[PDB]
């Protein structure tokens, strides 16, 4: 199907406690495959998936250099943004950056990304055209004017259309055993009495990959959206994910409730009911 590659970066200044911490992680779809942490003992880009380990030493050297260099430019930008926002040097601040590409089933570029946040708020973002910018405020407009003069968007467009897509295709082939395998959820429905009049029906989805999934409860075929407790999809820790949906049901009405499971690893969307 469709696939994605993303690089995530966070710098967090810590005045009086050394230089800003820099952590960056790379993903293909929902699979972590590289990491760099400026606080590690001998900081290097490290593999986090088996299909990336075969890349040779010059790969790891180039990725290490880029990460270290991005750590340095974030530290300069943190100082710059203190000026742009008229802020004291005493507080901790955060810079986040994500970039990457989505490709369709044929491997062609669907769209690229490159966007920033300062202290958790949108700062500047490359638009879907990969040629213009959206700046969130007059400070980010200063960066916008800098980046337009240095023609940053052209370099990004060349990367996102070229290397991003091509290396994603390479990774997808090398890790096809896992990256191109969908693991359907194992599903069941539990029943948890609350009082003489009420019980909780909880619909479980376990062990699935990728993370995208739909769990819904229906009552007499009508979606219980407002009365359904839906936990955030969560990592099991073994590459797979978990989720549940729950409704509080009048005792005796259990059979009017159906749980519906959509997942790309399922040929047909599933329907299941509480089975006493």
């Amino acid at each position: 199907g469709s696939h994605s590659m993303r690089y995530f970066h966070t710098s967090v200044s810590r005045p009086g406690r050394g230089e800003p911490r820099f952590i960056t992680v790379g993903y293909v779809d929902d699979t972590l495959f590289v990491r760099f942490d400026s606080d590690a003992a001998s900081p290097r880009e490290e593999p986090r998936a088996p299909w990336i380990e075969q890349e040779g030493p010059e790969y790891w050297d180039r990725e290490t250099q880029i990460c270290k260099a991005k750590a340095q430019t974030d530290r300069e930008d943190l100082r710059t943004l203190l000026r742009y926002y008229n802020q004291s040097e005493a507080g901790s601040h955060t810079l986040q950056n994500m970039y990457g590409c989505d490709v369709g089933p044929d491997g062609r570029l669907l769209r690229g990304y490159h966007q920033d946040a300062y202290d958790g708020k949108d700062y500047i973002a490359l638009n879907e055209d990969l040629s213009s910018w959206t700046a969130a405020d007059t400070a980010a407009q200063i960066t916008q004017r800098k980046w337009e003069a240095a023609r940053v968007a052209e370099q990004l467009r060349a990367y996102l259309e070229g290397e991003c897509v091509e290396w994603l295709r390479r990774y997808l082939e090398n890790g096809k055993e896992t990256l191109q395998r969908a693991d359907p959820p194992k599903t069941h429905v539990t029943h948890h009495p609350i009082s003489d009049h009420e019980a909780t029906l909880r619909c479980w989805a376990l062990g699935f990959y990728p993370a995208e999934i739909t769990l819904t409860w229906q009552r007499d075929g009508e979606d219980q959206t407002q009365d359904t407790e839906l936990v955030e999809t969560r990592p099991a820790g073994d590459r797979t994910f978990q989720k549940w949906a729950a409704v509080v049901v009048p005792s005796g009405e259990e059979q009017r409730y159906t749980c519906h499971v959509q997942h790309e690893g399922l040929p047909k969307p599933l329907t299941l009911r509480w089975e006493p």
Binding site: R62, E63, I66, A69, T73, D77, T80, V152, Q155
Partner: peptide, 9 residues
């Protein structure tokens, strides 16, 4: 693999 250019803000 990563983007190599290093624009400053």
């Amino acid at each position: 693999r990563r983007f190599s250019r290093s624009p400053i803000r």
